[PDB]
């Protein structure tokens, strides 16, 4: 599948992931940004039988931002695709939702885009 | 946590989830009809120690749209919060990414929202 | 710093005037720049932004109709302008198609783009 490995996003976050034969994603995520320290558990899913027409491999995963050091009362999901070849990449969009009151729910969700490669960029 | 069990959107699409003491979400997502060809694996995470100040519980999950019958070569993630009380709800925004060629990657990702309740409509 | 011409990585060409009233007005066209590829845009920007190196918030819309073509869709870009020697407009976009109610769930694409002052 090409997905199992250690990846870095453009901010220097570390995504250590394993792809299972059944479509499972497991591993740890360490964010370079936000209300986060050390590693967090992730789980997700990927297409274990991608198209044979040159298309990327669809995938997604979630981190809830709780570990034994801190709890940001938040979760991020990344939705994207793995693209193999010369310079392997996982291109994603993400949604970071915080637990809020109903009155603050309108501002609960940040959105962005992360690109992951095997190199840790400056 | 109040999350374990069955949740329905407005069409009656149905997810059945276990929310473990380990922070894991595990289950299935299927149509209102619930035939096997409509059922897909769901996996995600939630905040197992939410704030005690009247805030919701953050969570998210993924479904890759492959099962034993079909493969759409795509995956959806839902990011949202569980809101307990008299009429419990899970409010989400979602991102659906298709596997594409590089030329079509610009149009790979749909965005939307959905809300789930415990009562089948 | 916003008024002028901006390019994405494909060389698509965004021509904008940032008015003293907070208005953005201009056109967006392909790298080829033929008339069939040119569309009107309008939007707004913060006309009194921070002066500390932070970006200037802005947004604009293109409806994908001109005198030659109509895709029945519209894109909005939301982002910020950052000036200096290597100026940028960094954006995320939403592209909504006109759909039936049954197809509305798949009406809106999301993405991103970055514009620079040189090709």
């Amino acid at each position: 599948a090409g997905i199992t490995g250690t990846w870095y996003n453009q901010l220097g976050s570390t995504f250590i992931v394993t792809a299972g034969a059944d479509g499972a994603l497991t591993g740890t995520y360490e964010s370079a940004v936000g209300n986060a320290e050390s590693r967090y558990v992730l789980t997700g899913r990927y297409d274990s039988a991608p198209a044979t027409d040159g298309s990327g491999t669809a995938l997604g995963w979630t981190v809830a931002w709780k570990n034994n050091y801190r709890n940001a009362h938040s979760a991020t999901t990344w939705s994207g695709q793995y693209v193999g070849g010369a310079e392997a990449r996982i291109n994603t969009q993400w949604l970071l939702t915080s637990g809020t009151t109903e009155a603050n729910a309108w501002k609960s969700t940040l959105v962005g885009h992360d690109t992951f490669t095997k190199v840790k960029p400056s | 946590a109040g999350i374990t069990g069955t949740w329905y959107n407005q069409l009656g699409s149905t997810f059945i989830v276990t929310a473990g003491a380990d922070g894991a979400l595990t289950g299935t997502y299927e149509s209102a009809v619930g035939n096997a060809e409509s059922r897909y694996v769901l996996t995600g995470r939630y905040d197992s120690a939410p704030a005690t100040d009247g805030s919701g519980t953050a969570l998210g999950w993924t479904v890759a749209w492959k099962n034993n019958y079909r493969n759409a070569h795509s995956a959806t993630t839902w990011s949202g919060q569980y809101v307990g009380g008299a009429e419990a709800r899970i409010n989400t925004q979602w991102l659906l990414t298709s596997g594409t060629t590089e030329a079509n990657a610009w149009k790979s990702t749909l965005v939307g929202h959905d809300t789930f309740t415990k009562v089948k409509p | 710093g916003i008024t002028g011409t901006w390019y994405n990585q494909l060389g698509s060409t965004f021509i904008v005037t940032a008015g003293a009233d907070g208005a953005l007005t201009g056109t967006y066209e392909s790298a080829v720049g033929n008339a069939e590829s040119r569309y009107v845009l309008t939007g707004r920007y913060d006309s009194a932004p921070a002066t500390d190196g932070s970006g200037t918030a802005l947004g604009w819309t293109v409806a994908w109709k001109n005198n030659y073509r109509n895709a029945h869709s519209a894109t909005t870009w939301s982002g910020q302008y950052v000036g200096g020697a290597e100026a940028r407009i960094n954006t995320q976009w939403l592209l909504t198609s006109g759909t039936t109610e049954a197809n509305a769930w798949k009406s809106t694409l999301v993405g991103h783009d970055t514009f620079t002052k040189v090709k």
Binding site: - | - | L10, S37, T75, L95, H112
Partner: peptide, 11 residues
């Protein structure tokens, strides 16, 4: 395409 591809750099 739902709109011109050239106008939409990253997905």
């Amino acid at each position: 395409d739902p709109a011109p591809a050239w106008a939409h750099g990253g997905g």
